[PDB]
Each structure stands twice: as structure tokens, then as C-alpha cells.
RNA sequence: GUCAAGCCGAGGAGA
RNA sequence: UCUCCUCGGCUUGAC
RNA sequence: GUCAAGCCGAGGAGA
RNA sequence: UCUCCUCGGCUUGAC
């Protein structure tokens, strides 16, 4: 084992209880410093003969695998027994078991908070905290008001008040495990005023109970000698094309307007214009009134489509709009198929016509953007001068700008000469209609970036976080900024001595404030921490223990007040209508549900009104008559059972019927029957 | 007839009705208690005057001889008449005649689903269950999805839906015959939360429509007081030798890598790798492209060797590369005697050389292993201390090494003096390359063990099933690990006072975490064991009903989805081509079928076509120009046929051409014509 | 009584 | 989906 | 080992 | 409240 005389003096208190929190810049080591711990605190139980329980909590799988696979266990695989969890691990063994065989643990917050609601509910033995003897947490920052980190540490707070409550009242008390935090950047929660940023630290320390945050300063030279710093760059274009195109789609918003007779009242292409078409659809699907419903929603996509050319060349917002269109002209012709709305029509004779006019204005690159251009002479101007030693790394906001992006970066050859090649990511959770990347996929890009099969690589905020790469020299932002956090660890994963950090941006963004305002609070946040280092210890325990107040009765209250806040025990008094069109699909009696998660009716009335569609290319998509999609067909208990979304119907109580829409089936309050198949046999 | 109380309290149910399932542990004389309810039901229908029909259904051969010969014949032989079927019986009389016959049935389950499938196809009358009186079932836990048992069970479950249908509609009904199960350890299916155990066994009951598990709980404690516990052992070892060889080996992989410039992403020697390698090999064959096929086979034959050798001796990873390239040498040399490709040079000439330095760095017993010297260190303590009482049985995982490691152990002069005799033994099921044992061999191995004539037994999963053995002290399993059931009942097999159940080990394999969860999961067997016989018996009939619907409907929709699922009718409409070289192999009009079995070609165009391999010391192997193997010779119709597997074949369709692999006759849509072999005549 | 070949299906473990 | 292991059934043929 | 679907919660940014 | 982005957990199913 190998320690450092930085590493020492920040985990000397905790080396003796003193349950507190580390701060040290990415590559310091935190995992080093967190085995030796345990190591120590095992070493200590063993030869004081007591039971030895140490988990480690991190909020990203990929982390536990890493932390499993390259540091934690090849220290400390011979003395005892190691595994790291996951919901991607199959836990065949069990969670209470692993907690009682290997003494230490690796795993995500939320499958220890799953076991303690399984015991607390009885359903499963589960286990409690006081069942272990050591906490580790990775990333304190992200334990802040009711996150998972924040429900676990809550829960030990609890504990914790009893204790004190048991002490001066019944001698025998609960044992509470140490306690120990590691991140880099504790965080400033918006907090401005260098008070409210110390008020906010304080809370994370009392959310913790921490004891200090026990920062380097008497080493803390030899860590920056040891510790390089990379090189920033800023980069400003202003906006002055897509006149032509622009102006005709603006004049298709003025004609559809005029059709509505509609008054925005703001600027086109601004998501206040989208907040407002969405409240407008809703208001008009709630009313039961056609002819502004689905003009809102056309509006809806042709602001989408606005906002995608105002940052995206034209071609990518005449590929969204015809993609959308084709889409739509595929469902009327299957509704004229299984057998003429005027808005439909009216808009559709509008826009075959603009959409041809729009392919003969689209052919032209003379005025495709500059910001583009920028970006091109950058990239070729950094690895020109890099000689293939440009591991390059763009960041930016959705993932159709990665997807395009990429393309038309391929699609350029003097990249081609250059030989850059680029590749796109993005994250996991499946969203905005776009394929989303998997795990497997995630770590295949990565690995061919690290080894070189990949110069170039297109990223969102996945990258922002973890991507533990050994080289990062540019690294470009374009036109994003998330927060002081991120934007540390982000230029801190520019891992080389020649790295160039730079914000190719428009003028409108006010990047540059930000990234201001981020170096400030990072020097805010370490006089806060000097503060904390040096406030009263009696005044340090009184506030955190205030806080720690704050949190429990926050917490208690939010209980109460979610207790049931719903309650109505009406199995079948409710008729459920299309959205688009205004007709009775369905009661709350001829309805059922299936393993408490999926919703679905299988009456014939049901079956002889709807309509399929062919599946996209088993789990073909069913909509209405009007073409609103109503939701998938599924195969659970092998029938072909088609699934709805309650967010693409509308709802009509028999009493009073105050229409209202509820976008997700477990808001709303009342409660729907089990599926109950010995009906539909032979 | 002997019965004894718990017997009595188990069976008690069943005299009457009650079609139930028992579970008791080894060597509690279940056969006992069949064998007296089934003479209690004979003897109930002879006096109520009613056709008695009982059959006994056993998945294992050798199950029914030994319950044909032991237990169940002697002691009913006089009243009634008893028989046992199985397929190497020759079933000369008939199925159903012995049916309408005997009275008394015993046999393996596949023999009644083949006569009830005859029966509805028409081509024979075969029988109906309705014709049976009583169906007893052993190893019920084998009862699930889709095995026999359940096929069975699901034909009974059909009928019984159907009388149920009736009886409130129409008072005639088919009647059912009782049914009993019988086994040891219901099991768990993957099940981890106890409720989900309690989900497996009610699908289980389901399964066999039983009212209740009826497990032993008053007379418990004499029964425990009867049988007895064995002693556990665990041995661990870590790795840390190889390296030369091993190194050297990887080198070998990597200068293979950079000739075909491939990254495998993954650790050498992981069976992933194999999983890419058989993938890339696919692609490679439908592209057509040569130079990575034959290069990818060539790296699963390397990485096969690295997996063996991390298993094995550096001499068995030895012979078999070099009994392989012996072979593509021979088929090399045949080629040229017929009558230079730049992969198979390259490679060939890289080997020569290196297999001549691995022969020399072969002879080095330095470093040979570890694992093997503590299981010598093992075996020699316990048969020391056992002097000549131990009946040694090892356990391991595939056919190489109980071959490998019986010679080994042979050659070892430290058994010899302690006077240990090792044989090997495996299964019947022709694969992998290995001999397998016959049935006969395999009882001839037994006979001997049993006697004493050998002292250690190595075998495989076998062994862990049947194989009743009086006597069995040092059971040993070396780095394997099954399943709860089957753990459960070796530790069982291990039938004598003073036994060791000792598991060797490597450090790597998790084998602890899965006893300790096999005892965790006996204990939650037994515990949802006695929830179902404490459930309220109508919940439990509406569960049991419920689990029979899911069984009967997913078997319909099984059968729809399986109706056909490919049609097509082309003769003659494809061609079929040599995998590892792309040319014009046959087409659809030539090819022949014969038994709709095998399938065959005799065209003088394939005849001088292809290549002869001299039987290996009649069924002689038929390959190609570049030493492809294509298939066996064959002797049926007299006429010297050429049989081929499709495995080694590729297809290409006349009219689009969508290269793919099929890797079975019957998967493909298409169909062949017959052999009329009117032609060939003279 | 013994052997060889081929085909079909099923289960378990691992990945 | 792939590997390993196990089981049963059917056909042919030979000794 | 891989894929698809669905559901639940949480965080960050912007408005 | 809406949009965008990210994360984790659960269930099903298939290969
Ligand atoms: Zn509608
Ligand atoms: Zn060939």
C-alpha cells in the first residue's frame, strides 16, 4: 500500500472516527485514500474483535465496476472478501446475505434503500444501518435535498436524534457506523451571497453529519506542484444568415396563424412560444373544441422546427418537419384505407406545396451558417498542429445536433484528408424519439476512442461526468454551459499538458459570465471551506445539528402532507375519451390492469373501434380513428393486449365531469382492477 | 408390506383421492410408499369393481430398470402384472396392448406422449389419459415449462378445463385419473424473493393440478433422528504460475491479431472472446470474404488452448492444438495428393516453428500448477487416514478433463503406493469431439466402483444424478457448481457415516456464495412449503387454477405462433456453396432426401467435385478443394451415399441473395424432394 | 447380448 | 445469441 | 453475453 | 408549470 503526506494529513481524523467529508481535484486519489481507510478501520475491528461492515454507496453503475475491477479490490481482495453490486449485476445471491458474507460492499445507493424499505414494510428482512459499521459515499455533492444519498443519510439522522434522545433519558443507545464522504467540488446550490454559499455547505456537512470537510493546507503546495493546470480559449460568432428560408417559415407561422387567429405575443423560435402552443393544446383538449388542438400541435413542430434551423443548418429542420409530415400522411392514408378534416386539409394543401418550395430553396449551401465554418477552421487549425495526436472532444446539447453533427462532419473531406474520424454519444435513457446508445454500445465508443480508432468524439453531459480518459486536448464546447461542478470536472478531464479548453459560442450566450462566476465561487467555496475549517466547534455542531432538524421535520411534513393526498375508491365511474376527437372510448369498468404497471382493455367494443397501425421498421403502435396514437400493442401472458397511454386520452367524471388531463396514469387518484383473466378463455 | 408412521402421514391424503405431491429426502423409501398406494388403489378398485390402470413415469432409463428390479416388481408381483418400457426395451408387443395388458405400467414419459400424439394424428390408435386410472410421477421438479412431464400435464389440464366447462353446462363428463408426484427438492426456478419462491412451487403444484405438497411435520423429528448429516470441507487455491507458456501463447494470439488487425476489446481467454471469434467467423462466411474465417476459426482453436491450459497442464492445451493441426496437416497434405493460400501458409509456417519451441518449453514441470499438487496433497491425506475404506468420487466439468486428469493420476507413483485405482466416467450423448461411454460401459464402471475393484471415480453431472452408490465418503468437486437441486443431492449421494463433501476450489469462483445460497434457499422451500399447506384452500384452488390458465394459454399460442412459421414451396430455387471457399457447391434440383432424414446428392457433377478423406482409424469423411469438411459417407440403400451437414454449407437464394447460415436441416423453410432413386438403376 | 452412425426434442450451468 | 454439461425418443446399419 | 418494450423515482440546465 | 439533458431502480419479453 502507498500513501502521500497530503493523503495522511486529510484522512488522519477519519482514521479515528470522525465522520467527516473529503475534497481533493480529480486524479488525487480519493479511491487510494478510501481503501486505506477501510483497510485501517478492518485492521482496527479485527484486532478489537468486532464485527467489521463497509459499503460503498456510488450513484453510477460504471463507477462500481470501475472502482470493483481496477483499485478497490486488487489492494484488498487477499484480507477479505470483496463484490461490487448493481441492477446490471445479476443479485442472485440476495442483497442481506452479501451483507452479511463479504463484510465489504460495493454498490448504488438505491439498492440498499429498496432493502431498508423492503424491512421497514416487512415484506423482506432487508437490513438496517445499524447492522453495519462504515459508510463510504462517492460524490457527495450530488446528497442535497431528497436524493438517494439524502434518504439514506436521513434515515441515519433519524437514528441519530433517538440516540440523543435515548442518552439523557436511557443509557443503551443504538450504534451509528462512521461516516466518511469523498467528491472534489462540494458545490454551491445557486447560492450567490459567500453567506448563503457557507449555508449551503454547512448543509451538505449536516446532511452528512461530517464532522469538517477537512481540507489539504499545509501540503497543499505540494499538491499543486503535482497537480497541472490546461489552457482555455474563447470563441464568439454572431448570427446574420437564414433570411430566405427563416422568413418563409415565419410567413407559414403568420398564414397558420391567421387561420387560428392567434396572437403570440413573442418572439418566434423561443420556448416561451412552445409553453404557450402547449397550454393552448391543452386548453383546447380540455374545451373538447377541433380546429386549434391539432393547429396547436403543427404550430408546436413548426417551432420545433424553427428553433432546430436556428441552430442546425436547414436540411436538418426540413428532414425533422418532413420526417413528422410523412409520418402524418402515413396515418391518413391508413384512416383512408380501413374506410377530410378542413384543418388538416387547409394545412396539408399549405404544405405540400411550401414543403416542394422548401426542396428547391433547401439546395442552397451559399448561406448554410458560419458558426459551422468557425468550428471547421478550428478543428482543422488544432489538429492540423496536433499531427494525429488530437484526441477531440465536442460537447453539446441534444442528441439530433450530435447525430447531424457527425454526419456532416464525415461528410467533409478535408477532415478526410486531415484523417479525423468522428463518432457521436450520447446517454441511455430513451427520449426525444431518437435511438437512444446502450450500455455495451457507451463502452464500445469509448474504447475505440481511447485506443485511437476514434480522433474525434461527439458527446453530451454523459461526458461531462466520468469517461475516465488518459488523454483529452480539445475539448470544445458548442454553445452549452451546465454549472460550476460540471464545468470543473469537465476541463479537469482535459488530461494533457497541452489542452485546449475552448467555447465556440454565440454572442447571445453569456458563457463567459458563467465560467466567471464559476472560477469565483470555486475561490468563494474555498474560503467558505477555511471558514467552516475555522468556525467553533460548538457553534459548527449547534448549526448542523439545526439543519439536521430542518431536513427531518422537512422530510416528516412532506410525509404527511403525501400520506395519500388522493383517495377515492371508484372502480368504474369515469368515462375515458380521445384526445384529438371527442368520442367515448372507454368506463372505468370494461378496463384492467396488469402486474400494477400496464393498462389495457381487451372488450370487443374495443376492439371493433380502434385502429393498428403496422409496426414501424410485434409491438405494433394502435391509434383512433383521427389519427391520435392511443398507444403499443404488448405480449404479457401471451395475449395481444393493447397497452394505452393515458397521456394521449382525456377523462370525464359521470358526476360533473370537470374535463382535465392527466399525463400519467399514478396521478390521478383513483384506482383501476386488477386484470382478472378467467374471462377471454376459449 | 412395511410402512412406517410418517410414511403413513404423508401418503394419508392420496388413499383417498387427493392427487397430490410428496417430498421427502434421499433414502426415504419414496418408492416404498408409491408401491403401497398403488396396491391400496388395486385393491380399492378390485373391490369396487372398476378398471384399475396405474403407470409410473420416470425421465431416466436406468431409473425404471433399477425400480422394475429392486422395489417395485417383488413386491406386487403376485396380485397383479408388471412390466417396464424404454426405448432400448424393444417394445415388441405394443405400447397400448401392455396398456390394456398389464395394468401396471412402468416408463419413461416420451414413450406416452409419442403413443398420445399418434392418437391425434390418426396414424395410430394409441391411448387417451382417460383410459388410465392413477399416474404416479418421479422427480417432479423436472415438471416445468415445456419438459415432458409437462406436456403431459398440460394434455390432463386441457381435459380438466374442459370437464369443468361441462359440468356446469352438460352433467357427462370425461373422468381424470389421480395423480401423485413424487421428488425430494421441488426447487427453485431462479426465484431469489420468497415470494417468488412461493410463485415457482404453486406453478409447480399447477403443473400437476396438486392440492398440496403434504410434507412430513409431526413425525418430523423421527425422521430427522433416521437420517443423517455428512461433513463439509472447502479448499481454496490462487493462480500465479503459467506465465511462460502463457505469455508466450498470447504472443502467438497477438502477431495472429495484427495479421488480421483485429482488437478483441476483452481479456484473452474468456469465452465472450470465443463468442466474438464464432460471430466474426459468421460474417466473415456470409460476406464471402476468405482470410478472416479460416483466421477466425484458427483463433477459437487458440483460445480454446488458452482456456485449457488455464484449466489444465500446459501438455494437454499441447495435444490438443497439435492433434488439431495434425489434422489440418493431413487434410493439407491430401489436398496437395489430389492435385498454397496465403493465411493458412503464414499461419502454418509461424506454427511449425512455434509448436517446435512449445514442445521444447513443454517439458518443464516447475511451474506445472498448484491446484493439482493441493488436490494430490488432498487425496493422499484422506485415503491415507481412510486405509483402503475411501470411495473416492470426483467431480469436474467436461469430458478432457476426467480424461486428462485419470491419466495423470495414473502415471502418479504416490496413488499407485497408496493403492488408489482411478477410472474416469462420463455421459452417453455423443459431442465434443470424445468418446462417449455407452450405457453398458457406464454400468460396467459402477459394477466395479461399487465392489471395490475402483477406488476413484472421476465423472461429470452424471454422477450427480442416479448413480446410488452404498457407499460414497470423499466426494471432491473440482471447480464446478450446478444448482440447488442437484447440490442437494450429491451431498446426499455422499452416503456414509464419516463423508467429506470437499469443494476445490480457485479463488475467482464464487462456489461458497452459492452453497450458502442453496442452504438459504432449502430453508425458504421449506418455509413457502408450509405457507401453501397453510393458504387457504380457496385461494390455493384459485392460484393452482389460475397458473393452469397461464400454462394452457401459453402453450396455445406456442402452437399458433408455431403453426408453420416458415412456408415455402421452391423445390428447386437456391444454391448451395462451400463455406471457407465461395464456389457453386449444388443446387435445389440435385439434392435428395432420404427417410425424410438425411440428405444426399449423387450427381457425377458432385461426384468429381469434391475430395475423399480416408476413414479415420465405412462412414468415411467426405471434404473439399480447401479442406473444408462437407460430411460423412453413408451406407443406406446399399448405395455409397455422401450424407453433408448444412452446418459447413452456405446458402444463396435465385432471387435476392441474402447469404445466411442455417446450422440444421429442419430450421431452413424450404423443403427437398424424396430419393426416387428409379434412376441410378443400372 | 454388443457396437457404430445419423436425426429430433428437452433440461441444467455459465457467459 | 454462444459455449459446456446432461437426459430421453426415433431411424438405419453392423457384429 | 446481447437486444427490445414498459413503468417508477431522482438530479442538472434553461425558460 | 413547460422544454432539453443526465442518472439510477423495478418488471416483462426476446435473441
Ligand atoms: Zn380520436
Ligand atoms: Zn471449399
Known amino acids: 500500500l502507498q500513501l502521500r503526506p497530503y493523503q495522511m494529513e486529510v484522512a488522519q481524523p477519519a482514521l479515528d472516527g470522525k465522520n467527516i467529508i473529503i475534497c481533493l481535484p480529480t486524479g488525487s486519489g480519493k479511491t487510494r485514500v478510501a481503501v486505506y481507510i477501510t483497510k485501517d478501520h478492518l485492521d482496527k475491528k479485527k484486532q478489537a474483535s468486532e464485527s467489521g461492515k463497509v459499503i460503498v454507496l456510488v450513484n453510477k453503475v460504471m463507477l462500481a465496476e470501475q472502482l470493483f475491477r481496477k483499485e478497490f479490490n486488487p489492494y484488498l481482495?487477499?484480507?477479505?472478501?470483496?463484490?461490487?453490486l448493481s441492477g446490471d449485476t445479476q443479485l442472485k445471491i440476495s442483497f442481506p446475505e452479501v451483507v452479511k458474507s463479504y463484510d465489504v460492499i460495493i454498490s448504488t445507493a438505491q439498492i440498499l434503500e429498496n432493502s431498508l424499505l423492503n424491512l421497514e414494510s416487512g415484506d423482506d428482512d432487508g437490513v438496517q444501518l445499524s447492522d453495519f459499521s462504515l459508510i463510504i459515499i462517492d460524490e457527495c455533492?450530488?446528497?442535497?435535498?431528497?436524493?438517494?444519498?439524502?434518504?439514506?443519510?436521513?434515515?441515519?439522522?433519524?437514528?441519530?436524534?433517538?440516540?440523543?434522545?435515548?442518552?439523557?433519558?436511557?443509557?443503551?443507545?443504538?450504534?451509528?457506523?462512521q461516516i466518511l464522504g469523498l467528491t472534489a467540488s462540494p458545490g454551491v446550490g445557486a447560492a450567490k451571497k459567500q453567506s448563503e454559499a457557507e449555508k449551503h455547505i454547512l448543509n451538505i456537512c449536516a446532511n452528512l453529519d461530517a464532522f469538517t470537510i477537512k481540507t489539504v493546507k499545509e501540503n497543499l503546495g505540494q499538491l499543486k506542484h503535482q497537480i497541472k493546470e490546461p489552457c482555455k480559449k474563447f470563441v464568439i460568432a454572431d448570427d446574420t444568415r437564414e433570411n430566405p428560408f427563416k422568413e418563409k417559415l415565419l410567413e407559414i407561422m403568420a398564414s397558420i396563424q391567421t387561420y387560428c387567429q392567434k396572437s403570440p405575443m413573442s418572439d418566434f423560435g423561443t420556448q416561451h412560444y412552445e409553453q404557450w402552443a402547449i397550454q393552448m393544446e391543452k386548453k383546447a383538449a380540455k374545451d373538447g373544441n377541433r380546429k386549434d388542438r391539432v393547429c396547436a400541435e403543427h404550430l408546436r413542430k413548426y417551432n420545433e422546427a424553427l428553433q432546430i434551423n436556428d441552430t442546425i443548418r436547414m436540411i436538418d429542420a426540413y428532414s425533422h418537419l418532413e420526417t413528422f409530415y410523412?409520418?402524418?400522411?402515413?396515418?391518413?392514408?391508413?384512416?383512408?384505407?380501413?374506410?377530410?378534416?378542413?384543418?388538416?386539409?387547409?394545412?396539408?394543401?399549405?404544405?405540400?406545396?411550401?414543403?416542394?418550395?422548401?426542396?428547391?430553396l433547401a439546395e442552397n449551401p451559399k448561406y448554410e451558417n458560419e458558426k459551422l465554418i468557425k468550428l471547421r477552421n478550428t478543428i482543422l487549425e488544432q489538429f492540423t498542429r496536433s499531427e494525429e495526436s488530437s484526441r477531440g472532444i465536442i460537447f453539446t446539447k441534444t442528441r439530433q445536433s450530435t447525430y447531424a453533427l457527425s454526419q456532416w462532419i464525415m461528410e467533409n473531406a478535408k477532415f478526410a484528408e486531415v484523417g479525423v474520424k468522428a463518432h457521436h454519444l450520447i446517454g441511455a435513457g430513451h427520449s426525444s424519439e431518437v435511438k437512444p446508445m446502450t450500455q455495451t454500445e457507451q463502452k464500445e465508443v469509448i474504447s475505440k476512442f481511447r485506443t485511437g480508432e476514434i480522433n474525434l468524439l461527439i458527446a453530451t453531459t454523459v461526458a461531462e461526468e466520468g469517461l475516465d480518459i488518459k488523454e483529452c486536448n480539445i475539448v470544445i464546447r458548442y454553445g452549452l454551459v451546465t454549472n460550476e461542478i460540471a464545468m470543473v470536472q469537465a476541463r479537469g478531464r482535459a488530461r494533457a499538458d497541452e489542452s485546449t479548453y475552448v467555447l465556440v459560442t454565440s454572442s447571445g450566450s453569456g458563457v463567459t459570465e458563467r465560467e466567471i462566476v464559476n472560477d469565483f465561487r470555486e475561490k468563494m467555496m474555498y474560503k467558505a471551506i477555511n471558514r467552516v475549517q475555522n468556525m467553533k466547534p460548538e457553534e459548527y455542531a449547534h448549526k448542523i445539528l439545526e439543519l439536521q432538524v430542518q431536513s427531518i421535520l422537512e422530510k416528516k411534513m412532506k410525509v404527511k402532507r403525501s400520506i395519500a393526498k388522493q383517495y377515492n375508491d371508484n372502480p368504474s365511474?369515469?368515462?375515458?375519451?380521445?384526445?384529438?376527437?371527442?368520442?367515448?372510448?372507454?368506463?372505468?369498468?370494461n378496463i384492467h390492469v396488469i402486474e400494477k404497471m400496464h393498462?389495457?382493455?381487451?372488450?370487443?367494443?374495443?376492439?371493433?373501434?380502434?385502429?393498428?397501425?403496422?409496426?414501424?421498421?410485434?409491438?405494433?403502435?394502435?391509434?383512433?380513428?383521427?389519427?391520435?396514437?392511443?398507444?403499443?400493442?404488448?405480449?404479457?401472458?401471451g395475449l395481444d393486449l393493447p397497452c394505452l397511454k393515458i397521456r394521449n386520452f382525456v377523462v370525464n367524471f359521470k358526476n360533473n365531469s370537470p374535463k382535465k388531463q392527466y399525463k400519467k396514469w399514478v396521478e390521478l387518484p383513483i384506482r383501476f382492477p386488477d386484470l382478472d383473466y378467467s374471462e377471454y378463455c376459449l
Not at 77 to 84: E, L, N, S
Not at 327 to 353: G, I, Q, R, W
Open 77 to 84: 481482495k487477499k484480507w477479505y472478501r470483496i463484490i461490487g
Open 141 to 177: 455533492h450530488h446528497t442535497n435535498k431528497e436524493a438517494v444519498y439524502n434518504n439514506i443519510m436521513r434515515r441515519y439522522l433519524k437514528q441519530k436524534l433517538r440516540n440523543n434522545d435515548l442518552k439523557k433519558q436511557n443509557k443503551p443507545a443504538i450504534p451509528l457506523p
Open 326 to 360: 410523412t409520418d402524418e400522411k402515413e396515418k391518413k392514408f391508413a384512416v383512408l384505407n380501413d374506410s377530410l378534416d378542413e384543418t388538416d386539409e387547409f394545412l396539408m394543401n399549405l404544405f405540400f406545396d411550401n414543403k416542394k418550395m422548401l426542396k428547391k
Open 573 to 589: 365511474l369515469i368515462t375515458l375519451l380521445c384526445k384529438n376527437c371527442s368520442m367515448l372510448v372507454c368506463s372505468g369498468e
Open 599 to 637: 393498462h389495457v382493455n381487451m372488450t370487443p367494443e374495443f376492439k371493433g373501434l380502434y385502429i393498428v397501425r403496422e409496426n414501424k421498421t410485434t409491438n405494433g403502435e394502435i391509434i383512433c380513428k383521427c389519427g391520435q396514437a392511443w398507444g403499443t400493442m404488448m405480449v404479457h401472458k
